[PDB]
């Protein structure tokens, strides 16, 4: 077990202020002898639920509150025990974010929202509207520069624009999310995405741009604007690029609705140090002195500790962050939330690459989120289709569903709640895509006219040998 006794192990996403948390670590060793080890695994949002299945993994996991409901469902999270004294010390807004089934399942740390960052030297007046940007780009290209570059590979980043004209994740009727009602296929969503597809088509943005491309492009000086969070400031500051942080553009008059996220720290249900951890977080990290350590390394954003948030909220950058939170909505923490993220991730990618039409793409994003769970084994993958597609109570027969290319003959288990596909990867895949580090296998599940994309990533070191 990573988790030993008398020793703390923390997992935090690589982009956050990990070394600064390490300083808050060492200040906890010099006071208690308990060593704190902080590490930053890749895809750690996905690594955590696998290892902690078997009691493995860290004592404390740091991530945006949205994944924690899923974690807690699968019984991999400790319920935290903070007293009345402490609960008053953070913003109620943030406690409610870390709650699930009426239990607190993590400690809220900071509030994050995507603002629009811009180069005052290249563009002393940011655009107020999305519709301005194509034009703006032309003029800018003529000067050897570009208008806007941001991470098109994650959904987090393109959502503010989809939601804008009335996209949403899961409908919230009567204080409960209807998990069969996804607002990714509606007209407002189609509007947002189409506009974004055209930016790509008109060479105003490239479909390939990812987090590290966009970040360099801007920090070098090659792009006017970018979309990103508080954590990206640390670097921008270093490039000495003269920048400001303002409200995201509007679309069809309406504002961009970023998802607001609450950086939360969660205690492992299998950890033998649940009290030592409880102490680290409550009295060393969640303090005016401790938060400063991290926020110094990589800005946390609008920190949830009332105390320091107030001392800090006189920053125009956080000022913008908060304005954008306002026009946002907050992330659901339900389990299905990660199916959503995958659905949409694929949709955007397929639309922007022309693999699917925006209509078909977002049509699929619905079924995928509402009724599909994909699970990728070594040389076979498992596709679990919920029998009731959209809540109708009208179930489908196994003959309505079709997986992979023609030669793909999967074994079909059929319960009364699901229909299960167990399929031979190589034999069923419709296309494999090689990247510097990854291999993505892709195939389609058809139902009705609709085609939902089934998609499995692996690293490229699985070739050596026998795939
Ligand atoms: O892209 C989907 C992804 O978005 C969010 O993750 C954010 C995270 O919240 C940010 O703080 C930052 O680290 O960038 C991430 C996006 O690349 C969700 O929290 C996550 O569950 C979701 O999969
Ligand atoms: Ca829908
Ligand atoms: Ca720093
Ligand atoms: Zn790392
Ligand atoms: Zn144009
Ligand atoms: Zn083969
Ligand atoms: Zn292998
Ligand atoms: Zn062989």
- HEC string of the chain? CCCCCCCEEEEECCCCCHHHHHHHHHHHHHHHCCCEEEECCCCHHHHHHHHHHHCCCCCEEEEEHHHHHHHHHCCCECCCCCCHHHHCCECHHHHHHCEECCEECCEEEEEECCEEEEECCCCCCCCCECCCHHHHHHHHHCCCCEEECCCCCCHHHHHHHHHHCCCEEEEECCCCEEEEEEECCCHHHHHHHHHHHHHHHCCCCCCCCCHHHHHHHHHHCCEEEEEECHHHHHHHHHHCCCEEEECCCEECCEECCCEEEEEEEEEECCCCCHHHHHHHHHHHHCCHHHHHHHHHHCCCCEECEHHHHHHHCCCHHHHHHHHHHHHCEECCCCCCHHHHHHHHHHHHHHHHCCCCCHHHHHHHHHHHHHHEEEEECCCEEEEEEECECCCCCCECCHHHCEECCCCCCCEEEECCCEEEEEEEHHHHCCEEEECCCEEEEEEEEEECCEEEEEEEEEEHHHCCCCC
Considering the four listed CATH numbers 3.40.50.970, 3.40.50.300, 3.40.50.2300, 2.60.40.3210, the one that applies to the domain covering 374-467 is 2.60.40.3210
Find the 467 Cα to ligand 7 centroid distance in Å: 6
Q: Of 64, 66, 338, which is best to mutate to test ligand 1, by the most ligand atoms within 8 angstroms of its C-beta?
A: 64
C-alpha distance from residue 150 to each of 212, 219, 259 (Å)? 9, 12, 16
Q: Are 344 and 156 in contact (CB under 8 A)?
A: no
| Token couple for 46 | 């996905």
- Residue of minimum CA distance from atom 11 in ligand 1: 64
How much distance in Å is there from the Cα of 376 to the middle of ligand 8? Answer: 22
Centre of ligand 6 from the C-alpha of residue 380, in Å? 12
Task: Please tell me the distance between residue 426's alpha carbon and the centre of ligand 1 in angstroms.
Answer: 30
Ligand 1 atom nearest 67 alpha carbon: 21
Pairing of strands 380-386, 372-376: antiparallel
**Which of 355, 360, 364, 348 is CA-nearest to residue 197?**
348
Query: C-alpha angle with apex 212: 244 to 110, nearest 5 degrees?
Result: 55
Ligand 1 binding pocket (C-beta < 6 A) is 13, 15, 45, 64, 66-67, 112, 154-156, 229, 261, 341
Q: 221: which 2 tokens?
A: 């000086």
Tokens of 407: 């030669």
Residue (of 110, 88, 170) closest to 295 by Cα position? 110
Asked whether the beta carbons of 41 and 11 are under 8 A apart, the reply is: yes
| Residue 363, CA distances (Å) to 17, 185, 420 in order | 38, 5, 21
Phi, psi of 450 (to 5 degrees): -80, 145
C-alpha–C-alpha distance, residues 277 and 214, integer Å? 37
How far is 84 from 425, CA to CA, in rounded Å?
A: 53
Instruction: Name the closest ligand to CA 70.
Output: 1
φ and ψ of 126, to 5 deg: -60, 150
How far apart are the C-alpha atoms of 280 and 29, rounded to whole Å? 10
Question: Ligand 1 atom closest to Cα of 151?
Answer: 17
The CA distances from residue 235 to 17, 114, 132, 212, in Å, are 12, 16, 28, 12
Residues of the chain with CATH 2.60.40.3210: 374-467
Nearest CA to ligand 1 atom 5: 156
Q: How far, in Å, CA of 307 to CA of 88, rounded?
A: 11
Phi–psi pair at 262, nearest 5 degrees: -115, 110
Number of Cβ within 10 Å of residue 124's Cβ equals: 10
Q: Which chain residues have CB less than 5 Å from ligand 5, an ion?
A: 134, 202
Q: Which pair of tokens denotes residue 196?
A: 């974004």
Give the Cα separation of 114 and 226 in Å (integer): 10
Nearest ligand to residue 187 Cα: 2
Round to whole Å and give the CA distance between 340 and 179.
10
Give every CB contact of residue 178 below 8 A, 6+ residues apart in sequence.
Answer: 170, 171, 172, 391
Rounded-to-integer distance, Cα 304 and Cα 293, Å: 15
- Ligand 1, atom 17: nearest CA belongs to which residue? 154
Declared resolution, Å: 3.1
Q: Which ligand is nearest to the CA of 112?
A: 1
| The pair of three-digit structure tokens given for residue 346, joined into one six-digit string | 């694929």
CA of 422 to the centre of ligand 8 (A): 23
Closest approach atom of ligand 1 to CA 156 = 1
In the structure, ligand 3 is a single-atom ion and the residues with CB under 5 Å from it are: 234, 297
Q: How far is the C-alpha of 413 from the C-alpha of 408, rounded, in Å? A: 15
Do residues 403 and 421 make contact, with C-beta atoms less than 8 angstroms apart?
A: yes
Given a contact cutoff of 8 angstroms between Cβ atoms, the answer to whether 192 and 165 are in contact is: yes
Pair 389, 370: CB distance under 8 Å: yes
Nearest ligand to the CA of 186 is: 2
Q: Longest Cα pair distance anywhere in the chain, in angstroms? A: 65
Using an 8 Å Cβ cutoff, are 156 and 113 in contact?
Answer: no
| Torsion, Cα of 60, 61, 67, 71 (10° steps) | -50
- Asked whether 3 and 271 are in contact (CB, 8 A), the reply is yes
Q: Distance between terminal CA atoms of the chain?
A: 29
Chain center to CA of 456? 18
In CATH, the number for domain 1-112+261-332 is 3.40.190.10
Instruction: Give the Cβ contact number of residue 377 at 10 Å.
Output: 11
Span 113-260+333-370 CATH architecture = 3-Layer(aba) Sandwich (3.40)
Token reading at 92: 């109620």
Distance (Å) of CA 145 to CA 6, 115, 427: 54, 21, 45
Of all protein residues, the one whose alpha carbon is nearest to atom 19 of ligand 1 is 64
Residues of the chain with CATH 3.40.190.10: 1-112+261-332, 113-260+333-370
Q: In sequence order, what are the residues at sequence separation of 6 or more whose Cβ sits closer than 8 angstroms to the Cβ of residue 394?
A: 388
Structure tokens at 161: 């624009």
Centre of ligand 6 to C-alpha 50, Å, is: 28
């Amino acid at each position: 077990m990573k988790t030993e006794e008398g020793k703390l192990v923390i997992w935090i996403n690589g982009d956050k202020g990990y070394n600064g948390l390490a300083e808050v670590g060492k200040k906890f060793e010099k006071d208690t002898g308990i060593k704190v080890t902080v590490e930053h695994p890749d895809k750690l949002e996905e690594k955590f639920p696998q290892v902690a299945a078997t009691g493995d993994g860290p004592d404390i996991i740091f991530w945006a509150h949205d994944r924690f409901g899923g974690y807690a469902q699968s019984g991999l999270l400790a319920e935290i025990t903070p007293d009345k004294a402490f609960q008053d010390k953070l913003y109620p807004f943030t406690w409610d974010a870390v709650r699930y089934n009426g239990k607190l399942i993590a400690y809220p740390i900071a509030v994050e929202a995507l603002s629009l960052i811009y180069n005052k030297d290249l563009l002393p007046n940011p655009p107020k509207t999305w519709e301005e940007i194509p034009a703006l780009d032309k003029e800018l290209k003529a000067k050897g520069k570009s208008a806007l570059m941001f991470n098109l590979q994650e959904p987090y980043f393109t959502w503010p624009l989809i939601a804008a004209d009335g996209g949403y994740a899961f409908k919230y009727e009567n204080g409960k999310y209807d998990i069969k009602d996804v607002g990714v296929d509606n007209a407002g969503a189609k509007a947002g995405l189409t506009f974004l597809v055209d930016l790509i088509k008109n060479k105003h943005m490239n479909a390939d741009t990812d987090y590290s491309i966009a970040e360099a492009a801007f920090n070098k000086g090659e792009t006017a604007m970018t979309i990103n969070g508080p954590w990206a400031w640390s670097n921008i500051d270093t490039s000495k690029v003269n920048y400001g942080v303002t409200v995201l553009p509007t679309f069809k008059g309406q504002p961009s609705k970023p998802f607001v996220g609450v950086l939360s720290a969660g205690i492992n249900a299998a950890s033998p140090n649940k009290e030592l951890a409880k102490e680290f977080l409550e009295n060393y990290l969640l303090t005016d002195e401790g938060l400063e350590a991290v926020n110094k390394d990589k800005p946390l954003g609008a920190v949830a500790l009332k105390s320091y948030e107030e001392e800090l909220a006189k920053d125009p950058r956080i000022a913008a962050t908060m304005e954008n939170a306002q026009k946002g909505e907050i992330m659901p923490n339900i389990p299905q939330m990660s199916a959503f993220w995958y659905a949409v991730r694929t949709a955007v990618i397929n639309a922007a690459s022309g693999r699917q039409t925006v209509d078909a793409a977002l049509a699929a994003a619905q079924t995928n989120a509402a009724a599909v769970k994909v699970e990728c084994l070594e040389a076979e993958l498992v596709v679990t289709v919920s029998r009731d597609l959209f809540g109708t109570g009208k179930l489908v027969q196994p003959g309505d569903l079709t997986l992979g290319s023609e030669g793909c003959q999967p074994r079909v288990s059929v319960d009364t709640d699901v229909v299960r596909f167990n399929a031979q990867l190589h034999e069923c895949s419709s296309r494999v895509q090689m990247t510097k580090d990854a291999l993505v296998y892709s195939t389609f599940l058809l139902h009705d006219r609709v085609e939902v994309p089934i998609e499995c990533r692996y690293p490229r070191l699985e070739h050596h040998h026998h795939h």
